[PDB]
Amino acid sequence: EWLQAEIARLKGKSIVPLQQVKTLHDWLDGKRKARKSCRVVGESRTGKTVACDAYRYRHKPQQEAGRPPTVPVVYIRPHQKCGPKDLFKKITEYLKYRVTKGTVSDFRDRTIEVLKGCGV
DNA sequence: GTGAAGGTTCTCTTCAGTATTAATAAGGCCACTGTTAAAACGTACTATATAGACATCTCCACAAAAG
Ligand SMILES: Nc1ncnc2c1ncn2[C@@H]1O[C@H](COP(=O)(O)OP(=O)(O)OP(=O)(O)O)[C@@H](O)[C@H]1O
Ligand SMILES: [Mg+2]
């Protein structure tokens, strides 16, 4: 039935290349190039997440033989009230590493070496 | 020829074991939530306690007619 496929499409999300998104992507390129920390702020449902998420898809990881993958940009969304250990786990899991045991210091230290290992 | 070394037997072990009255426990790190006083602290719907710009009435003093 034709109707089912259109409803199945219309319930799903899509990405539209708005100039608001292009503005962030060119700007994030400047901050990434300058290796500069910054923030993105705006009202709810203005599209910040979709623009940032689209930017991560624009710079998917790269690989070399017998080397870990290199991951130019990491995008994470913490859970609410994210403590340090769970932020390290978020970063670690995005880089596909695992850390089953350790102090918070051990989670931090493993995060530092996997971040610089993948060269984010 | 008193002393030293050496010989000899002593049984049966189907008997003894198995139950309570029991003490608060005897675990320690890490992290991570989620209560639990209880302390610190913004600001509301009120109950009064005045302080003083005004309006009012009253008492006393002056021009027109008649004998
Ligand atoms: N670039 C876009 N293309 C298509 N749809 C978009 C885009 N940006 C936003 N939307 C629509 O608006 C919704 C809200 O956008 P988004 O998730 O980016 O919100 P947000 O700005 O990160 O908000 P919040 O701060 O509330 O989390 C999306 O889920 C999507 O439905
Ligand atoms: Mg968002």
- Residue A47, phi-psi category: left (phi > 0), alpha (psi -120 to 50), beta (remainder): left
d(CA A95, CA A110): 11
Dist. CA A118 → ligand 2 center (Å)? 26
Q: Residue A72's closest CA among A63, A84, A80, A85? A: A63
Query: Cα separation of A90 and A84, whole Å?
Result: 10
CA dihedral A106, A108, A112, A115 (to 10 degrees): 110
Resolution (Å units): 2.3
Q: For residue A46, what is the DSSP state?
A: S
Residues paired with A62 in a beta bridge: A70
Distance (Å, whole) CA A56 – CA A75: 6
Contacting residues for A52 by C-beta, under 8 A, at least 6 apart? A24, A28, A40, A75
Give strand letter and number of the nucleotide nearest A103 (CA to C1'): B30
- Ligand 1, residue A47: give the atom nearest the CA: 18
